[PDB]
Amino acid sequence: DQRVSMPYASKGLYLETEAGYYKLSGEAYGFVARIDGSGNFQVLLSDRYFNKTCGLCGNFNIFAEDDFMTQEGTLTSDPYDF
Amino acid sequence: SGKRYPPGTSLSRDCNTCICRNSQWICSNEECPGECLVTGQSHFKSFDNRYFTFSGICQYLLARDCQDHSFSIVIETVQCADDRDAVCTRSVTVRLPGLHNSLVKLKHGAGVAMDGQDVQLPLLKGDLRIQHTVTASVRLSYGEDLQMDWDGRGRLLVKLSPVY
Amino acid sequence: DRDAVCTRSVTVRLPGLHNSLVKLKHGAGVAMDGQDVQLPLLKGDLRIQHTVTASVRLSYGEDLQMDWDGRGRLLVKLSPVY
Amino acid sequence: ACLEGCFCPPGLYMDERGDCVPKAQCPCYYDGEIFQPEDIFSDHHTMCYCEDGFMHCTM
Ligand SMILES: *[C@@H]1O[C@H](CO)[C@@H](O)[C@H](O)[C@H]1NC(C)=O
Ligand SMILES: [Ca+2]
Numbered sequence: 142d143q144r145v146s147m148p149y150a151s152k153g154l155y156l157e158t159e160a161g162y163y164k165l166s167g168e169a170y171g172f173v174a175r176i177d178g179s180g181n182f183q184v185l186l187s188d189r190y191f192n193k194t195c196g197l198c199g200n201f202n203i204f205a206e207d208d209f210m211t212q213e214g215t216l217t218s219d220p221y222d223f
Numbered sequence: 224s225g226k227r228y229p230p231g232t233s234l235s236r237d238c239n240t241c242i243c244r245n246s247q248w249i250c251s252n253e254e255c256p257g258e259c260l261v262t263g264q265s266h267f268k269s270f271d272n273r274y275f276t277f278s279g280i281c282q283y284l285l286a287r288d289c290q291d292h293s294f295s296i297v298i299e300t301v302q303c304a305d306d307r308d309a310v311c312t313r314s315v316t317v318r319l320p321g322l323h324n325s326l327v328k329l330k331h332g333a334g335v336a337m338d339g340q341d342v343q344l345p346l347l348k349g350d351l352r353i354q355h356t357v358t359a360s361v362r363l364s365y366g367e368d369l370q371m372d373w374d375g376r377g378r379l380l381v382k383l384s385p386v387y
Numbered sequence: 388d389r390d391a392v393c394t395r396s397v398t399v400r401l402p403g404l405h406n407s408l409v410k411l412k413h414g415a416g417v418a419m420d421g422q423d424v425q426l427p428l429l430k431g432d433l434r435i436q437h438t439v440t441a442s443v444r445l446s447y448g449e450d451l452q453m454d455w456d457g458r459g460r461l462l463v464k465l466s467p468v469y
Numbered sequence: 470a471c472l473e474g475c476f477c478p479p480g481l482y483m484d485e486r487g488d489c490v491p492k493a494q495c496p497c498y499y500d501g502e503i504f505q506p507e508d509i510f511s512d513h514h515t516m517c518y519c520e521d522g523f524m525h526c527t528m
Contacts, residue, residue, distance in 0.1 A: 191513055212305050215526070266448070280513055302511040313510070314502065332496075332503030334425070341425035341501065376505070439474035440483075 227317070254385035259286060261298060261379040265310045270383065278310040285315070286381060292320050294369065312377035319365060322350060329374040333361050394459035401447060404432060409454040415443050482522070495522040 149156040153169040165174040171187035171221050178208045184198060191201050198209030207216055227332065233242045238255035257270030265278040280300050287295040291332040295318045303311035317327040328336045335342050335353055344361070346353040351365040360373035370382035400411040410418045417424050417435055426443070428435040433447040442455035452464035477489040484490045485528075497504040497519035502518045504510070511517060517526040 211516075213302065213307065213511065213516060215527070280511070302509065304509045309509075330502045331508075334501070334503060336501065337422070339421065340419070341428070343423045343425050346423070375503075439472070441474075 224226065241273065251259070256382055256384050259381045260379065260384075261285070261312055262299060262313075263377075264303065264308075265300070278308060280310055282316075285379070286383075288387065293323075294319055294365065296298065312374060312379060315374045316378055317371070327351075327353075327363065329363075329371070329379075331375060333359065333373060333375050335361060393463060394456060397456045397461055399445065399453070400434065404430065409433075409435075409445065411443060411461075413444075413452070413457060414458050415441065415455060417443060492521050496522040497522060499524040499526075 147156060147158070147163075155164075155166045157164045157166065159175070162177045163176060163184070167173065169176065171189050175183050177183075186201065188201070194201055195210055197211075200210060200221065201210040202208065209217050211217060211223055228243060230241070230243045230245075233240055235241070239251045239253055241250040245272035257269070259270050260268035265276050266274070267277065268274055275307075278300075280302055282297055282299045285296040285298045297316040297318070298312055299309050299314045299316065301313045303309045313331050315329045317329070319325050320329070330336060335344070335346070342353075344354050351363060353361060353363050356362045356373075360375070361371070362373075365370070368384040368386050370380070372378060372380035373375055388392060391469035395413050396410045399411070401407050401409070408420055414419060415437070416427070417426070418457060419428075424435075426436050431468040435443060435445050438444045438455075442457070443453070444455075445451070450468050452462070454462035477483070480491060481489040482492055482495050484495070493514050494506045496506060497508070499517065499519070504524070506519060506521070515528055517524055517527060518527075
């Protein structure tokens with residue numbers, strides 16, 4: 142809840158600005174998030190989580206049709222209740 | 224429990240009584256009723272005051288008389304939220320071979336259903352009585368050796384007397 | 388008075404289903420074969436449900452209706468097949 | 470038909486306890502069982518929930 146300044150580097154998470162746009166790097170944990178001026182979230186994520194992750198950005202597999210596997214595990218046709 | 228009592232007193236647990244004589248409580252060892260408890264998501268209590276958790280999704284057997292067959296209770300678990308670690312009780316099914324070999328069912332509300340038929344409470348049959356308690360919770364009472372509690376949102380109880 | 392003879396209950400009998408015996412009681416209550424029942428009661432043919440939540444309505448098939456016998460205002464609807 | 474009795478306005482629907490409520494907290498009656506307005510619910514194979522009065526099941 143405490144507002145901190147920026148940059149910031151605690152716990153292996155460097156919270157920087159790159160190219161006028163804000164970045165949150167976690168290379169120890171395997172991810173690089175960022176936001177632009179308009180507001181457009183982006184998540185670059187390593188191949189270590191191939192077949193492993195699941196969430197609102199889908200699993201990191203090769204296929205693109207099966208990547209709505211709900212928190213139970215259910216291939217749903219709807220992109221919304223997912 | 225960290226407080227002093229004079230001699231001759233008789234404090235009573237829920238189970239039995241104990242009396243102070245020569246700095247040594249004398250106590251009886253007569254049995255006292257047990258309570259299996261389902262509640263919360265998946266949190267069980269055995270009759271012997273054990274606590275544990277088992278988040279399975281099927282029709283499990285909660286209790287049963289096992290030398291004769293006066294009854295048998297059957298819990299029915301389902302997942303109950305988005306998470307996978309959330310498995311609440313939906314219904315429980317009771318079976319009385321002493322009366323018609325009937326089949327009572329406590330539903331996800333405060334409702335009861337004997338042999339498919341919904342029923343208005345009370346239900347004085349010969350042995351078993353089913354009635355509300357606060358008008359928000361059902362209570363089965365077969366004979367004088369069995370009680371139950373509401374399985375609407377999943378807080379089943381039992382009262383088994385020492386004859387079991 | 389002696390010139391006051393109201394209806395207390397009515398008893399219906401369906402030989403087509405179990406040779407059962409329905410009973411409409413002095414309230415809005417119903418009792419099949421001694422057992423009180425919560426409404427609705429969709430068995431195969433006969434439906435019993437409230438109407439305004441103050442009056443019962445039996446409906447056997449499509450050729451028979453009834454009405455509340457609580458305070459004594461029984462009705463029937465018999466279709467021309469009878 | 471167009472019957473006569475005690476109703477409540479079209480935004481409100483009738484609850485079991487005599488009060489009538491909007492369709493947000495209007496429970497579901499799946500398989501007879503009275504489920505609350507938010508009850509996620511599933512065996513292994515099926516997946517069902519109660520949104521606003523209706524029981525949205527899938528497989
Ligand atoms: C993903 O993991 C599952 C479960 O271990 C395995 O069955 C499957 O072959 C894996 N698929 C890929 C693309 O690695
Ligand atoms: Ca994919």
